[PDB]
Design an enzyme around this catalytic site. Structure first.
Site, PDB file in Angstrom:
ATOM      1  N   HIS A  68      64.213 -31.808  19.838  1.00  0.00           N
ATOM      2  CA  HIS A  68      63.646 -32.755  20.831  1.00  0.00           C
ATOM      3  C   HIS A  68      64.467 -32.774  22.121  1.00  0.00           C
ATOM      4  O   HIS A  68      64.888 -33.844  22.524  1.00  0.00           O
ATOM      5  CB  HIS A  68      63.521 -34.133  20.201  1.00  0.00           C
ATOM      6  CG  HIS A  68      62.379 -34.210  19.259  1.00  0.00           C
ATOM      7  ND1 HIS A  68      62.545 -34.183  17.910  1.00  0.00           N
ATOM      8  CD2 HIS A  68      61.050 -34.252  19.482  1.00  0.00           C
ATOM      9  CE1 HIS A  68      61.363 -34.256  17.330  1.00  0.00           C
ATOM     10  NE2 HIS A  68      60.433 -34.277  18.272  1.00  0.00           N
ATOM     11  N   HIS A 106      57.815 -36.631  28.128  1.00  0.00           N
ATOM     12  CA  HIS A 106      57.176 -37.273  26.951  1.00  0.00           C
ATOM     13  C   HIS A 106      58.219 -37.639  25.896  1.00  0.00           C
ATOM     14  O   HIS A 106      57.910 -38.522  25.092  1.00  0.00           O
ATOM     15  CB  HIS A 106      56.027 -36.424  26.400  1.00  0.00           C
ATOM     16  CG  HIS A 106      56.461 -35.341  25.475  1.00  0.00           C
ATOM     17  ND1 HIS A 106      56.973 -34.167  25.928  1.00  0.00           N
ATOM     18  CD2 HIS A 106      56.466 -35.268  24.130  1.00  0.00           C
ATOM     19  CE1 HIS A 106      57.300 -33.409  24.892  1.00  0.00           C
ATOM     20  NE2 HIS A 106      56.995 -34.059  23.780  1.00  0.00           N
TER      21      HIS A 106
END
Ligand SMILES: Clc1ccc(Oc2cnns2)c2ccccc12
Ligand SMILES: [Mg+2]
Ligand SMILES: [Zn+2]
Length: 313
Positions: A68, A106
């Site tokens: 991530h 995001h």
């Protein structure tokens, strides 16, 4: 305003394809992102001094976690670029601007843990945001960076265009909460198959943008096999750390996250492709026919996982 970004020939060509990998050279990713905005949006959408300062603050606020990270941000933004370029006329100027930024933002300040682990740990963000915890934090971090001095890339928009584009970005980022995807896709399935899907219905656009975001977010499964297989190491690296941290709270993690059950991975991939990935890109191809290459790629990789189990690799 006359300063175009150019890529080397191989990247110039490859970048237009859904399955494009952005490469191991971190220092080229920001130019890749700007190249995509300038082609997707126009060379006029953003003040280049501001966009470049936005990009570097967003990069700064991604952490050094296995999956991530900054590379994920850009990978997801590229997948949106491919979808937008293969569906030129279906999206407004604001949606093209907002969705590429939404994609880059995001997963802002992701720590490597699921909403679930935040709730079991009793993390302060689980008190501030009861559902879509990490996703409300990501959108929150986006607004913070837009509000730094010299970072408002939307400053040339009207007050109302501005509220529209932050609203597009908020919905888009919330929609990357995989918990919300299942319901969103089923509703889209029903609307398409009873023929009531209407792209002039704002509530219907919202749902379709949501599915695009889920599609871009899962695009690891739509790469050529060697990329898909190597990214799965990074994805599982985060999962097993979260599993380890669950064990520390005195909770057996789901097998997916237990590093003592590596054996179970290929069957777990199958489940994910069958339950999440294939449904996602099937529905996306029905609503947006020119995105079929994502479904085709996802299918090829499902097959590659089946061959892993059968001991053929
Ligand atoms: Cl291959 C792949 C891509 C994305 C996934 O969803 C995520 C949700 N949070 N981090 S990754 C997957 C979940 C399980 C197995 C494979 C996955
Ligand atoms: Mg996320
Ligand atoms: Zn993501």
């Amino acid at each position: 305003g006359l300063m175009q970004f150019t890529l080397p020939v191989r990247l110039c060509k490859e970048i237009e394809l859904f399955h494009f990998d952005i490469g191991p050279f971190e220092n080229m990713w920001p130019g890749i992102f700007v190249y995509m905005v300038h082609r997707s949006c126009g060379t006029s959408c953003f003040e280049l001094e501001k966009l470049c300062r936005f990009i570097m603050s967003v990069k700064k606020n991604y952490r050094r976690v296995p999956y991530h990270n900054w590379k994920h941000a850009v990978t997801v933004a590229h997948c949106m670029y491919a979808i937008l370029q293969n569906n030129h006329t279906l999206f407004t100027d604001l949606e093209r601007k907002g969705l590429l930024i939404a994609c880059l933002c995001h997963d802002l300040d992701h720590r490597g843990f699921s909403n679930s682990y935040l709730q079991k740990f009793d993390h302060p963000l689980a008190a501030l945001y009861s559902t879509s915890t990490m996703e409300q934090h990501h959108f929150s971090q986006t607004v913070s960076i837009l509000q730094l001095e010299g970072h408002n890339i939307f400053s040339t928009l009207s007050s109302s265009e501005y509220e529209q584009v932050l609203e597009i970005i908020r919905k888009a980022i919330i929609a990357t909460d995989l918990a919300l995807y299942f319901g969103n896709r089923k509703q889209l399935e029903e609307m398409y198959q009873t023929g009531s899907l209407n792209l002039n219905n704002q509530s219907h656009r919202d749902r379709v943008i949501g599915l695009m975001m889920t599609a871009c977010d899962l695009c690891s499964v739509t790469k050529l096999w060697p990329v898909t297989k190597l990214t799965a190491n990074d994805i599982y690296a985060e999962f097993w750390a979260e599993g380890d941290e669950m064990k520390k709270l005195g909770i057996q993690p789901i097998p997916m996250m237990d590093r003592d059950k590596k054996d179970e991975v290929p069957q777990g991939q199958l489940g994910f492709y069958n339950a999440v990935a294939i449904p996602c890109y099937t529905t996306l191809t029905q609503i947006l026919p020119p995105t079929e290459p994502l479904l085709k790629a996802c299918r090829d990789n499902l097959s590659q996982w089946e061959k892993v189990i059968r001991g053929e690799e």
